[PDB]
RNA sequence: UUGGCGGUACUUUAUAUCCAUCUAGAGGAGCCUGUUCUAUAAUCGAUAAACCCCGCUCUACCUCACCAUCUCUUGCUAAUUCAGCCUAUAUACCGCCAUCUUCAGCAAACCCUAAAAAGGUAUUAAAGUAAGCAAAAGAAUCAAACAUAAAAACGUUAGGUCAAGGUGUAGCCAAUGAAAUGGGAAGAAAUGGGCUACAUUUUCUUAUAAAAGAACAUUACUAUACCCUUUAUGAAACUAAAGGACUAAGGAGGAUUUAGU
């Protein structure tokens, strides 16, 4: 059950009882990307109207 | 403990029933493992335990089995280059004889509870009983 | 999926691309993301006795708890300050004196020689 | 720019503590296995360690060991000087104090023999110790030129008149040459209920295995798997292969053979029987004959067996076609 | 989250074939014989066709449980050759060694 | 077959040197962080149950499944109320019971009693739990009791017990009067609460109070209700207040316990001991001998948990042995603890360490040193990690046996139990070692011990700038260095008397001078004079004259020595 | 300022050489270098190096040790376990003697593996083996019994083998094999009119 | 060239452990197996399920003890019991380890429905087999 | 003054090795299959040695990534202006490999020189020394050897793989994402590999590779094509197997080339 593992481990990361090196890595690439102005657009407001 | 020792250790209650006991003519214990040395130590532990309980035991080594399969070494193309893997199974058979049902349960419990990690057992009990009362007398 | 996730050591090795065909024959900088993380600290702000808070406080055996939304936002901002401060420390450097010119090695002190065989400093 | 740690040098104080810990280890291992500490030996230790820490690793250097420190550690890594720093041996600064201390003794012996002044083959079937063995005696690394020079000096000692002291000395550097007896191991001669003499031997050719039972007295009746040999072996070449052992020793029609061959094909089963008959027939022939059989190929097992197929090629040696370029 | 959308579709195919197993067994039995009238057999041939296509058990594909690779999988472990080799080459599979002979 | 490992910590603690509890605080803290981690897991399991629902275990394991405590029956029916009562929710069940009454739907008397049981037992308060109480005159329990149309014996009985549990003694007795007027019959449990009530209430006259409690017993026979063990245990626990007058009554109870057929438990003796061996006993001249008779009666018997004060017995029995200073009795008590599985009733964390502390302290005082050291290796650390006073008792025993050669070893043991920086212990170790002279080998060994105890003071001083070297340790450490081939170190320690401004003692000063004469170093002899001048000790002048005769003083030394003599 | 905890000395130092070792390792546990008073070394050694020491040795931890099972423990254990065992009847001193009084052989198999589930499909199968000589069979019955059973009968050994695995449980398959024997025996004695046409 | 599980040569300054030093072909020769179960023995079932549990149990232990693992863990299954043997650095306070053991044991016992025990051997620092 | 460079020869050393020698093949026919081309509304990658039954130990639906049509817009997860992407770059990489290659080298710490651009050997010895990685040894093929596997460093080919998975940078977010249905066609074409046949050392039958009785050139040998029946799996035969007839070509293959001690 891939949903149980991903959901359970995600919840544990938010409770401070598990550390996901991969997620922390991705969280910082998003933070840096948003500062550079390359972040995800909002839904319905994409480049094409 | 040098001076501090239990006085009257409590022992489990073993109550003799009125039901007759099973009679195993033979009891074959086939242990399997990837490691021969573990089988040697387990064989030593099991043969010593049998001799200490009065059980008659004999041991032989069934021929080992090796299962091999081939895989593709590269992630993409390069068909001719392969990697091969194998799993080795080794066997030690403990053939016990003339066991009552009480002796076979206590012995099997003791040796099964001490079965090392990576070892699988295959007990093959052979019970002997009288003929069915109906079969004893032909009835038309 | 939880099973496609790799460790930090493997993630930085790929991203940095130090060992590669281009690198050897002809900038990304590594960072440690566990530097400021204290075991038992999560975004939800739960408080775990014996892990991230005192197990006993004023003689009272603590129980599980969670920080309020205001308190957690402070803790989040404080860590952000420490990270920025740590980054500022990384930027800060002690400049050494130049020699006969600013881009030349002549005249530059490189310290004393190393100790000798029997602790001869 | 060095992080690799220095090769460890062992002080005499260090090895001394390693021998006290080992001696306390033996008393504990003896107490565990319920044996007497006084008589507990190196053999008992190795057996106990194998039971208590079963390892099935194929390489035995990688298995658990509780050996005496003298074994696991190199014999002589001890300090070669004292507290004051003065070396212990007058040849220390040569760098090979043990090699040159030995070459000093043998050169002084040679001089006394030459100044002071029969067959020299006091020892036969012996060889000079190999460099690896010499290095073990000295406990120091030697070069090929150092070994070659050492032997020449020892040879010169033998050439000269040698008292019993010299002969004992050169003996230390002579190792008995291994004695591999290329002589067949004759089987016993059992007796049947009828009282007739018979010998048995096994044989293996390819995957076939045979167990022959030659009888000392017979009319030449060979029965394979309870069948006759003309019926069992309808091919002439298989029967000729059974004829080779007896025909060679001119013993046709003088023995009664009972064979049991399982496995392999027709030719592999005849070959397996031939060896089984040749090995059983040894008990009823003279030693000079047994040597004639051994030298005619009748007593050697054939080691040729099918080679495995290799991945990425059509066969054991056959390769896939090299696509036309 | 499953590995990809292809593994998700297969997972649904596996859960709908389990639901309709008894039904497809009982109905298909009426067709795999010569003892019942051909009129009934032709009609049972249509009841089975009307069931949803994802109930059909021949639309299940064995994919690596960790990478969702459709081919190259070993059925005893449910892993692809690439994933199996990574666990095996690191001593993480109990009893699997390289084959030297 | 197996016995306790004397060189290992209790099995709960992790078998690793880094993770073994050094002190008693780390023992409890390690068993409070483990329980906290278990509670953190049970919180997650019970809060995200969808992730812990796949069951792959055959046979099925019920105790490894997520728990559900919130009612899942939505409809408002007597059945739904029964669920809440089963789940033990107090406020929710009251709401649905009132709602059932509002509709008027029938509610079974048995179901109405299960509601009162929950409310009476928890006293109208939600059950205690952990996640992220007197009886109230106006409460749901009493209100629901009145609303009940039909009452039965159980209903009244439940109220009497809940009231007594939540300290409503006066009301509970009134409720019982109603039960008698209705002609209903109470059960054993209700009679036990009533006896517990009369005792807790303070009656002016004991004779009246005792005759009252007996009247409850007399009504227990009129109603054909037979007493249980708890009934007698409750009466004896009440009697512990009147030590003087409860002795004859207490014995009569135990005789009646056997005649009825109730078997006295460990708790029953725990109460007689309290009543016969008062802790605050002024009359220690002629103590009672009952403890000897009790232990003879219980010799070899095995006991099981049958009351809530069984654990208390062993800790109380060992204490009584220390008061009487009878070590033979302590062996009987410990011998009883070892029969069967009596070890399980020693007590909890507070009473487990008191029993063994009292036992081991008694051993060292009244036992041969050889036997005392056998007990020491067995009990410590496996049974209990002792507090520092235990080591002071052990060191004193070694001194009384003239076996001070072992004092260095006891010091090494103490460091593992977090006594490395204990001032009282360090002062005792050095004191005994340096109290008298010893052969050269023993003095050298003591000197090494003195050096180790010095490092503790030195390392401690490094941490704390406001550090004080106590005067007596300085004297003991300096003397030991002189006596044990460490004279050079002792001369350096002479300067520490001035750094910390500690007054050197007359004995120590003259000892330094004696060593100087053997060495023949006038310089070292004058160094002692310098320190004597600093503190203006009168003997310093005499010591300076002694140096003049002991050694030949050079003219330069004469001027230097004369200056110090003037100073 | 921060204080790093200091590990205690290993408890092997306090262990006497005449200790009660069974108490040290009562049950199966992993190798603990701090509890095993042995200078054991394991690991392929580097050139001019000795095998690695026990402390921090993953190879020793990977071994299924038998420290809990020592000749002293095994003998002390079996002494307690003797009360459980029952005595085999002395009269049945031979295999032939057993066949006389107990002709029926019932084979049952157990399987022990590692995992969360104790279930194995192969444990249901049962096998009954009886010799026709042991059964009271007339000349007619024995011929009828041998024809009905087909290949279950072995002429060389004269043993009838009934293998029953169709039922889910072992108690059902066992009761079925006994049932199959009863019907075959009783049917063999019955004589049908069509049998006269053989 | 083969790149599988080979810690390649640096310049003599890389500290590799015993397990890392040995390439795959030394398995069953110089180094053993990190997991020992009966699921790959001949005529045994549930290899796929035992292997999946191992993959998870290794990722769980790394995250639960982040930076505190000196070497790979060893998993030992006997009957339905699971035993995790991990070499852990002495970085965290002692009481914190008692928390993570109680937590990681209870959590994995309610997740796989087996009795799970954690065995921790504390090292002062990573043990270096050789410098490569 | 070092290095490079040769289309350099001679002399050794070995190589199923250039040639020579040996055996069975390929190149011709029929088929199976990969590729290119042509071509389709209709994937992608590999594509000198080191691609071409290659990723696939495998495509009727599914697989699937492609094409057409219709449909969904917080759209797997506890949370997230987020989910998702087989979208571009293998010339950003990890991972896992090919190639030289079972070739013999790569890298670091010291010491020495009337200065070092570099070098550092002499054995009856003249400045080199002492540790690593590879080779070797050891282990595996359950005696022993041999053999076979395995092993084979640093580099070379920006070699292969963003489509195993992960991932840097850039791009899509009512669409480059998700889902359903139906399709993804063929060849007077070239080419790689395999299969079968061309027969008499053969064909058919019984046995069994023993022996025996028949057949033996126009269809005798000879179709794993097409076509026609039946059975197997499936929901679906478009697939596979077994018979049936039908039978065409093929008569041992030009230069040239592959493997084997
Ligand atoms: K690459
Ligand atoms: Mg400038
Ligand atoms: Mg071939
Ligand atoms: Mg399929
Ligand atoms: Mg398709
Ligand atoms: Mg489709
Ligand atoms: Mg797409
Ligand atoms: Mg590339
Ligand atoms: Mg490309
Ligand atoms: Mg070998
Ligand atoms: Mg090699
Ligand atoms: Mg490229
Ligand atoms: Mg799309
Ligand atoms: Mg033939
Ligand atoms: Mg069909």
DSSP strand pairing (H15-16 vs H130-131): antiparallel
Scanning E5-67, the segments in alpha helix (DSSP H) are: 5-19, 21-29, 38-50
Residue of E nearest to A10 (CA): E1
Tokens of F499: 């750094």
Which residues are within 8 A (CB) of D158 and not within 5 positions of it... i.e. 6 or more apart? Answer: D120, D170
What ranges in F282-387 are assigned the alpha helix state H? 290-297, 310-324, 327-338, 349-366, 369-379
Q: 């040790």: which residue's tokens? A: G65
Strands B120-129 and H15-16: unpaired
- Per the structure block, which two tokens stand in for F442? 């023993």
Across the strands, what pairs with D212?
Answer: D201
Rounded Cα distance, G37 and G21, in Å: 10
- Distance (Å, rounded) from C-alpha H63 to C-alpha B111? 37
From first CA to last CA, the distance across chain H in angstroms is: 18
Which residues lie closer than 8 Å to C37 by C-beta, 6 or more apart? A19, A24, H66
List the structure tokens of F70: 């919130």
Q: Which of F529, F532, F519 is CA-nearest to residue F560?
A: F529
Number of C-beta neighbours around residue H24 at 10 A: 19
Q: Find the D212 Cα to ligand 1 centroid distance in Å.
A: 62
Task: Give the list of residues 6+ apart from residue D12 with CB closer than 8 angstroms, or none.
Answer: D78, D79
Q: Which helix (H) or strand (E) holds D15?
A: helix D12-33
Give the Å distances, CA to CA, from D240 to D243, D245, D248. 5, 10, 12
Q: In chain F, after which residues does the backbone break, taking C–N over 2.5 angstroms as a break?
A: 132
Please enumerate in sequence order all residues whose Cβ is within 8 A of that of F241, keeping only pairs 6 or more positions apart, or say none: F199
Q: Who's near F552: CB < 8 A, 6+ residues apart?
A: F522
Closest CA to F310 of F237, F255, F241: F237
Reduce the DSSP state of residue D190 to 3 states and report it.
Answer: strand
d(CA E69, CA E86): 15
C-alpha to C-alpha distance for D309 and F354, rounded to whole angstroms: 77
Q: How far is H121 from H88, CA to CA, in rounded Å? A: 6
Rounded Cα distance, C15 and F307, in Å: 68
F26-to-B75, C55, F13, F383, F385 alpha-carbon distances in Å? 53, 12, 11, 15, 10
C-alpha span between G42 and G73 (Å, rounded): 25
Q: How far is the CA of C28 from the C1' of I117 (A)?
A: 38
Distance CA B25, CA G95 (A): 8
* Cα–Cα dist D196/H39, whole Å: 56
Alpha-carbon distance values, D68 to D17, F37, H98 (Å): 12, 46, 39
DSSP F478-506: HHHHHHTT-HHHHHHHHHHHHHTT----H
The separation between CA G59 and the C-alpha centre of its own chain, rounded to angstroms, equals: 30
Distance of CA B126 to the CA centre of its chain: 14
What's the length of chain A?
Answer: 49
Q: Are F2 and G80 in contact (CB under 8 A)?
A: no
Identify whether the C-beta of residue H3 lies closer than 8 Å to the C-beta of residue E58.
no
What distances in angstroms separate CA F316 from CA B6, F268, F313, G51, one per listed residue? Answer: 21, 12, 5, 56
- Among all bound ligands, the one having the nearest atom to the CA of C102 is 2
Please name the chains neighbouring D, where neighbouring means 3+ C-beta pairs under 8 angstroms.
B, G, H
Question: Distance, CA E62 to ligand 7 centroid (Å)?
Answer: 22
Contact list in C for residue E67 (CB cut-off 8 A) is 4
3-state secondary structure chain G: CCCCCCCCCCHHHHCCCCCCHHHHCCCCCCCCCCCCCCCCECCCCCCCCCCCECCCCHHHHCCCCCCCCCHHHHHHHHHHHCCCCCCCCCCCCCHHHHHHHCCEEEEEEEEECCCCECCCHHHHCEEEEEECCCCCCCHHHHHHHHHHHHHHEECCCCEEEEEECCCCCHHHHHHHHHHHHHHHHHHHHCCCHHHHHC
Handedness of CA F149, F153, F156, F158 (dihedral sign): negative
Question: CB-based contact (8 Å) between F56 and chain A?
Answer: no
- Measure the CA–CA gap between F377 and G163, rounded to whole angstroms: 63
Residues pairing with H118 in the sheet: H84
CA–CA distance from E73 to each of E11, E70, E78, F145, H54 (Å)?
A: 16, 7, 6, 70, 19
Q: Which nucleotide is nearest to C1 (CA to C1')?
A: I77
Burial F555-564 (b: 16+ CB within 10 A, else e): eebeebbeeb
Does E4 contact chain A (CB < 8 Å)?
no
Query: What span, in angstroms and rounded, lies between the C-alpha atoms of F130 and F132?
Result: 7
Phi, psi torsion values for B26, nearest 5 degrees: -140, 155
Report the distance separating Cα H127 and Cα G54, nearest Å: 11
Method: cryo-EM
Structure tokens at C114: 């190393």
Residue E7 C-alpha, separation from nearest chain B C-alpha, in angstroms = 20
Q: Are F191 and F221 in contact (CB under 8 A)?
A: no
SS3 assignment for chain C: CHHHCCCHHHHHHHHHCCCCHHHHHCCCCCCCCCCCCCCCCCCCCEECECCCECCEECCEECCCEECCHHHHHHHHHHHHHHHHHHHHHHHCCCCCCCCCCCCCCCCCCCCCCCCCCCCCC
B130 by DSSP, 3-state: which? coil
Phi and psi at F6, nearest 5°, equal -70, -20
- How far apart CA B115 and CA G27 sit, in angstroms, is 12
Q: How does DSSP classify residue D182? A: -
B95 forms beta bridges with B28, B58
For F536, which DSSP code?
A: T
Calculate how far, in angstroms, residue C21's C-alpha sits from the geometric centre of ligand 1: 8
Q: How far away, in angstroms, is C20 Cα from ligand 12 center?
A: 13
Please state the φ and ψ torsions of residue G48, each to the nearest 5 degrees. 60, 35
CB contact under 8 A, A1 and F54: yes
Q: Which residues contact H69 (CB under 8 A, 6 or more apart)?
A: H61, H62, H86, H87, H88, H89
The crossing angle, in degrees rounded to 10, of helices E21-29 and E38-50 is: 160
Q: Does H56 touch chain E (CB under 8 A)?
A: no
Q: What is the rounded distance in angstroms from the CA atom of residue D72 to the CA atom of residue H112? A: 45
Tokens 């281009």 map to which residue? Answer: C22
Question: Could you give the CA distance from residue D192 to residue C36 in angstroms, rounded to a whole number?
Answer: 89
Structure tokens at B21: 């006991």
Which letter, b or e, does each residue of F195-204 get, where b requires 16 or more Cβ atoms within 10 Å of its Cβ?
bbbbbeeeee
Q: Which two tokens stand for residue D32?
A: 């565990």
Question: 3-class DSSP state for residue D223?
Answer: strand
The long-range contacts involving C84-88, CB below 8 angstroms and separated by at least 24 positions, are C86/C35, C86/C36
**Residues H7, E91: contact at Cβ < 8 Å?**
no
Instruction: Write phi, then psi, for H116 (nearest 5 degrees).
Output: -120, 130
Which of E15-24's residues contact partners 24+ apart within 8 Å by CB, and which partners?
A: E16/E52, E16/E54, E16/E55, E17/E54, E17/E55, E17/E56, E17/E57, E17/E59, E17/E60, E19/E55, E20/E51, E20/E52, E20/E55, E21/E57, E23/E51, E23/E55, E24/E48, E24/E51, E24/E55, E24/E56, E24/E57
The bound ligand whose nearest atom lies closest to the alpha carbon of E5 is 7
Nearest to G59 among H32, H44, H130 (CB): H32
Measured CA to CA, the distance from residue D132 to residue D75 in angstroms comes to: 15
Would you tell me the crossing angle of helices D131-138 and D144-159 to the nearest 10 degrees? 90
Give dist(CA C6, CA F100) in Å, integer: 58
- Interatomic CA distance for residues G198 and F171, integer angstroms: 99
Distance separating alpha carbons of residues F327 and F347, to the nearest angstrom = 21
> Token pair 């003799």 is at which residue?
B16
**Chain A residues with CB inside 8 Å of F40's CB?**
17
In the stretch 42-81 of chain E, residues with CB closer than 8 A to chain C read: 65-67
E strand segments, D55-158:
126-128
Q: How far apart are CA D257 and CA D269, in angstroms?
A: 15
Mapped to the 3 state alphabet, what secondary structure does F86-148 carry? HHCCCHHHHHHHHHHHHHCCCCCHHHHHHHHHHHHHHCCCCCCCCCCCCCCCCCHHHHHHHHC
Report the alpha-carbon distance of residue D299 to residue D276 in Å, rounded. 9
Report the C-alpha gap between B43 and F450 in whole angstroms: 56
**Calpha distance F245→G38 (Å, rounded):** 64
Note whether E101 and D308 are within 8 A (CB): yes
Residues 2-31 of H with CB under 8 A from A: none
Q: Is the bond preceding F503 in cis, omega lying within 30 degrees of 0?
A: no
Checking each nucleotide's C1' against the CA of B70, the nearest proves to be I57
CA distances from D175 to B115, D158, D218, H76 (A): 49, 16, 50, 50
Q: Residue D81: which region, alpha, beta or left (left: phi > 0; alpha: psi -120 to 50)?
A: beta
The rounded distance, in Å, linking the Cα atoms of H35 and H74 is 6
With tokens 């007295």, the residue in question is D217
- The dihedral formed by the CA atoms of F137, F139, F140 and F144, expressed in degrees to the nearest 10: 20
Angle, in degrees to the nearest 10, between helices F388-400 and F349-366:
10
d(CA G136, CA B136) in angstroms, rounded, equals 7
Give phi and psi for F130, each to the nearest 5: -120, 130
Q: Which subunits count as partners of chain E given 3+ CB pairs below 8 Å?
A: A, B, C, H
Residues of H in contact with E92 (CB under 8 A): 33-35, 54, 58
Q: Cα(F505)–Cα(F385) distance, rounded to whole angstroms?
A: 37
Q: How far is the CA of D149 from the C1' of I10 (A)?
A: 37
Residues G132-167: b if buried by 16+ CB within 10 A, e if exposed: bebbebeeebbebbbeebeebbeeeeebbbbebeeb
Measure CB to CB from residue G58 to each of H44, H71, H112 and give the nearest one.
H71
* Ligand 15 centre distance from Cα of residue E24 (Å): 16
Let me know: does F387 contact F24? Beta carbons within 8 Å.
Answer: yes
Measure D264 CA to I253 C1' (Å).
40
| B1: nearest Cα among F338, F362, F328 | F338
Q: Looking at the DSSP assignment, which residues form a beta bridge with residue D256?
A: D215
Strands B82-100 and C56-57: unpaired
CA D92/CA D98 separation, integer angstroms: 9
DSSP state of H85: E
Which class for F472: exposed (0-12), middle (13-18), buried (19 or more C-beta within 10 A)? Answer: middle
CB–CB of C86/C104 below 8 Å? no
Q: Which CA distances in Å does H114 have to B113, H63, H107?
A: 16, 21, 11
Other CB atoms within a 10 A radius of the CB of residue C28 amount to 8
Across the interface, whether the CB atoms of H64 and A17 are under 8 A apart is answered: yes
B67 SS3 class:
strand
Question: Which positions on chain I have an atom < 7 Å from some protein CB?
Answer: 25, 45-46, 48-65, 73-79, 81-86, 91-100, 107-110, 123-125, 130-133, 138-161, 164-175, 177-181, 191-194, 209-210, 233-236, 257-261
């Amino acid at each position: 059950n891939h949903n149980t593992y991903f959901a359970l481990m995600g919840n544990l990361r938010f409770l401070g009882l598990y550390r996901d090196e991969h997620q922390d890595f991705k969280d910082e690439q998003r933070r840096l990307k948003k500062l550079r102005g390359k972040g995800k657009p909002r839904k319905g407001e994409g480049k094409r109207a | 403990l040098h001076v501090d020792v239990p006085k009257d250790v409590t022992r489990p209650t073993i109550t003799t029933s009125d039901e007759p006991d099973t009679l195993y003519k033979r009891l074959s214990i086939l242990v399997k493992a990837h490691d021969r040395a573990v089988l040697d130590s387990y064989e030593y532990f099991a043969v010593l335990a049998a001799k200490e309980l009065g059980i008659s035991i004999k041991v032989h080594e069934p021929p080992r089995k090796i299962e091999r399969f081939t895989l593709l070494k590269s992630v993409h193309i390069f068909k001719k280059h392969r990697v091969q893997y194998e799993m080795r199974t080794l066997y030690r058979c403990l053939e016990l004889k003339h066991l009552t049902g009480s002796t076979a349960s206590v012995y099997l419990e003791y040796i099964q509870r001490n079965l090392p990690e990576g070892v699988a057992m295959e007990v093959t009990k052979t019970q002997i009983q009288q003929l069915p009362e109906h079969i004893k007398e032909p009835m038309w | 999926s939880f099973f496609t996730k790799l460790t930090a050591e493997e993630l930085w090795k790929g991203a940095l691309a130090e060992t590669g065909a281009g690198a050897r024959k002809g900038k990304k900088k590594r960072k440690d993301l566990n530097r400021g993380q204290i075991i038992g600290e999560g975004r939800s702000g739960f408080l775990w006795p014996g892990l991230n808070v005192p197990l006993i406080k004023s003689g009272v055996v603590q129980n599980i708890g969670q920080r309020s939304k205001e308190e957690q936002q402070k803790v989040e901002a404080t860590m952000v300050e420490q990270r920025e401060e740590w980054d500022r420390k990384r930027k800060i450097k002690v400049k050494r004196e130049r020699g006969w010119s600013g881009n030349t090695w002549g005249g530059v002190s490189i310290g004393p020689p190393d100790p000798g065989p029997n602790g001869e400093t | 720019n060095v992080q690799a740690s220095r090769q460890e040098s062992y002080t005499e104080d260090f090895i001394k503590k390693q021998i006290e810990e080992f001696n306390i280890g033996k008393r504990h291992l003896a107490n565990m296995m319920g044996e007497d500490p006084e008589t507990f030996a190196e053999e008992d230790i190795d057996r106990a360690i194998a039971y208590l820490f079963p390892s099935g690793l194929f390489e035995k250097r990688a298995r658990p060991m509780m050996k005496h420190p003298e074994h696991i550690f190199p014999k002589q890594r001890a300090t070669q000087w004292g507290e004051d720093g003065r070396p212990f041996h007058f040849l220390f600064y040569t760098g090979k104090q043990s090699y040159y201390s030995l070459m000093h003794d043998v050169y002084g012996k040679v001089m006394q023999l030459e100044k002071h002044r029969a067959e020299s083959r006091d020892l036969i079937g012996s060889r000079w110790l190999i460099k690896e063995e010499l290095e073990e005696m000295l406990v120091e690394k030697l070069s090929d030129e150092d070994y070659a020079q050492f032997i020449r000096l020892l040879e010169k000692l033998l050439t000269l008149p040698c008292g019993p002291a010299e002969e004992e000395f050169v003996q230390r550097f002579r190792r008995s040459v291994t004695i591999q007896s290329k002589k067949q191991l004759i089987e016993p001669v059992q007796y049947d209920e009828q009282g007739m003499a018979f010998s048995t031997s096994e044989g293996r050719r390819k995957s076939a295995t045979a167990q022959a039972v030659v009888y000392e007295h017979g009319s030449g009746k060979i029965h394979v798997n309870g069948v006759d040999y003309l019926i069992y072996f309808p091919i002439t070449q298989d029967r000729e292969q059974l004829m080779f052992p007896f025909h060679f020793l001119d013993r046709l029609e003088r023995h009664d053979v009972t064979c049991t061959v399982s496995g392999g094909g027709r030719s592999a089963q005849a070959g397996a029987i031939r060896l089984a008959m040749a090995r059983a027939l040894c008990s009823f022939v003279t030693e000079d004959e047994v040597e004639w059989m051994r030298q005619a190929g009748l007593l050697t097992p054939d080691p040729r067996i099918r080679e495995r197929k290799k991945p990425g090629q059509e066969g054991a040696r056959r390769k896939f076609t090299w696509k036309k370029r | 989250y499953y590995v990809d959308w292809r593994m998700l579709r297969d997972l649904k195919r596996r859960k709908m074939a389990y639901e309709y197993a008894d039904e497809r067994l009982r109905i298909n039995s009426l067709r795999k014989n010569t003892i019942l009238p051909k009129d009934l057999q032709e009609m049972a041939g249509d009841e089975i066709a009307a069931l949803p296509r994802d109930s059909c058990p021949v639309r299940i594909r064995n994919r690596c449980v960790m990478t969702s690779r459709p081919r190259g999988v070993k059925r005893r472990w449910r892993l692809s050759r690439i994933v199996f080799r990574h666990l095996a080459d690191h001593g993480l599979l109990s009893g699997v060694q390289r084959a030297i002979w | 077959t197996v016995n306790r490992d004397p060189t290992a910590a209790p099995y709960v603690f992790h078998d690793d040197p880094y993770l073994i509890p050094t002190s008693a605080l780390e023992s409890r803290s390690f068993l409070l962080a483990k329980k906290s981690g278990e509670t953190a897991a049970k919180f997650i399991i019970n809060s995200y149950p969808k992730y812990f629902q796949k069951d792959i275990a055959e046979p099925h394991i019920p105790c490894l499944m997520p728990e559900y405590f919130e009612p899942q029956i939505e409809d408002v029916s007597e059945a739904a109320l029964e669920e809440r009562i089963r789940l033990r929710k107090v406020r929710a069940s009251v709401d649905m019971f009132d709602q059932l009454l509002q509709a008027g739907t029938t509610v079974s008397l048995e179901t109405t009693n299960s509601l009162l049981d929950l409310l009476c037992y928890y006293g109208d308060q939600e059950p205690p739990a952990d996640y992220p109480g007197p009886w109230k005159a106006q409460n749901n329990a009493e209100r629901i009791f009145a609303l009940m149309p039909e009452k039965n014996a159980r209903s009244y009985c439940t109220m009497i017990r809940g009231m007594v549990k939540h300290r409503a003694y006066a009301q509970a007795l009134n409720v019982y009067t109603e039960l008698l007027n209705n002609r209903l019959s109470a059960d054993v449990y209700t009679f036990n609460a009533l006896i517990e009530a009369k005792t807790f209430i303070l009656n002016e006259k004991f004779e009246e109070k005792w005759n009252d409690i007996l009247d409850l017993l007399k009504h227990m026979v009129a109603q054909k209700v037979k007493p249980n063990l708890q009934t007698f245990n409750t009466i004896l626990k009440g009697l512990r207040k009147c030590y003087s007058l409860g002795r004859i009554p207490a014995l009569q109870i135990l005789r009646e316990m056997k005649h009825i057929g109730i078997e006295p438990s460990l708790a029953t003796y725990h109460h007689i001991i309290h009543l016969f061996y008062p802790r605050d006993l002024s009359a220690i001249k002629m103590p009672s001998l009952i403890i000897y008779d009790i232990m003879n009666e219980l010799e070899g018997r095995t006991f099981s948990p049958q009351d809530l004060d069984d654990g208390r017995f062993f800790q109380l029995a060992m204490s009584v042995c220390s008061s009487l200073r009878d070590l033979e009795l302590a062996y009987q008590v410990h011998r009883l603890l070892n029969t069967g599985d009596n070890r399980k009733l020693v007590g909890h964390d507070p009473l487990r360490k008191v029993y063994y502390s009292k036992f081991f302290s008694l051993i060292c005082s009244l036992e041969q040193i050889d036997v005392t050291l056998k007990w020491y290796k067995d009990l410590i650390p496996s049974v209990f990690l002792p507090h520092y006073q235990i080591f002071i008792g052990l060191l004193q025993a070694l001194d009384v046996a003239n076996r001070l050669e072992l004092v260095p070893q006891i010091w090494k043991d103490s460091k593992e139990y977090s006594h490395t920086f204990r001032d009282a212990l360090r002062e005792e170790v050095l004191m005994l070692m340096a109290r008298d002279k010893h052969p050269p080998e023993l003095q050298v060994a003591f000197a090494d011990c003195a050096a180790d105890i010095k490092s503790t003071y030195e390392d401690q001083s490094a941490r704390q700038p406001a550090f004080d070297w106590p005067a007596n340790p300085l004297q003991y450490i300096a003397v030991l260095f002189l006596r044990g081939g460490r004279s050079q170190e002792a001369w350096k320690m002479l300067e520490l008397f001035k750094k910390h401004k500690k007054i050197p003692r007359n004995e120590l000063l003259e000892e330094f001078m004696d060593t100087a004469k053997a060495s023949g170093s006038t310089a070292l002899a004058i160094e002692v004079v310098k320190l004597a001048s600093a503190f203006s000790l009168p003997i310093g002048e005499s010591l300076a004259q002694r140096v003049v005769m002991d050694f030949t003083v050079d003219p330069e030394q004469k001027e230097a020595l004369g200056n110090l003599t003037e100073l | 300022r921060p204080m790093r905890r200091k590990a205690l000395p290993p408890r092997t130092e306090k262990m006497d050489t005449d200790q009660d070792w069974p108490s040290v390792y009562p049950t199966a546990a992993p190798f603990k270098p701090s509890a095993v008073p042995l200078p054991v070394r394991m690991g392929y050694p580097v050139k001019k190096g000795v095998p690695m020491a026990k402390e921090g040795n993953l190879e020793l931890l990977k071994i299924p040790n038998f420290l809990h099972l020592t000749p002293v423990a095994i003998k002390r254990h079996c002494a307690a376990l003797k009360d459980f065992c029952t005595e085999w009847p002395a009269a049945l001193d031979s295999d032939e003697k057993c066949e006389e009084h107990f002709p029926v052989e019932i084979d049952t198999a157990d399987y022990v593996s590692s995992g969360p589930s104790i279930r194995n499909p192969k444990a249901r199968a049962v096998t009954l083996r009886v010799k026709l000589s042991s059964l009271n069979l007339d000349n007619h019955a024995k011929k009828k019994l041998i024809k009905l059973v087909g290949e279950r009968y072995c002429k060389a050994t004269d043993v009838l083998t009934i293998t029953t695995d169709r039922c889910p449980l072992k108690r059902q398959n066992y009761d079925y094999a006994v049932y199959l024997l009863t019907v075959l025996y009783h049917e063999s004695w019955k004589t049908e009119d069509w049998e006269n046409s053989k | 060239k083969n790149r599988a599980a080979r810690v390649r040569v640096a310049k003599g300054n890389k500290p590799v452990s015993y397990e890392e030093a040995h390439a795959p072909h030394y398995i069953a020769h110089r180094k053993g197996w990190l997991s020992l179960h009966t699921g790959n023995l001949d005529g045994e079932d549930h290899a796929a399920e035992r292997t999946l549990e191992d993959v998870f149990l290794r990722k769980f232990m790394m995250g639960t003890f982040p930076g505190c693992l000196a070497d790979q863990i060893v998993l030992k299954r006997r009957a339905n019991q699971v035993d995790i043997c991990a070499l852990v650095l002495r970085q965290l306070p002692a009481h914190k380890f008692y928390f993570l053991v109680g937590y990681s044991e209870t959590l994995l016992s309610h997740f796989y429905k087996c009795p799970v025990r954690l065995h921790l051997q504390t090292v002062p620092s990573k043990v270096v087999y050789k410098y490569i």
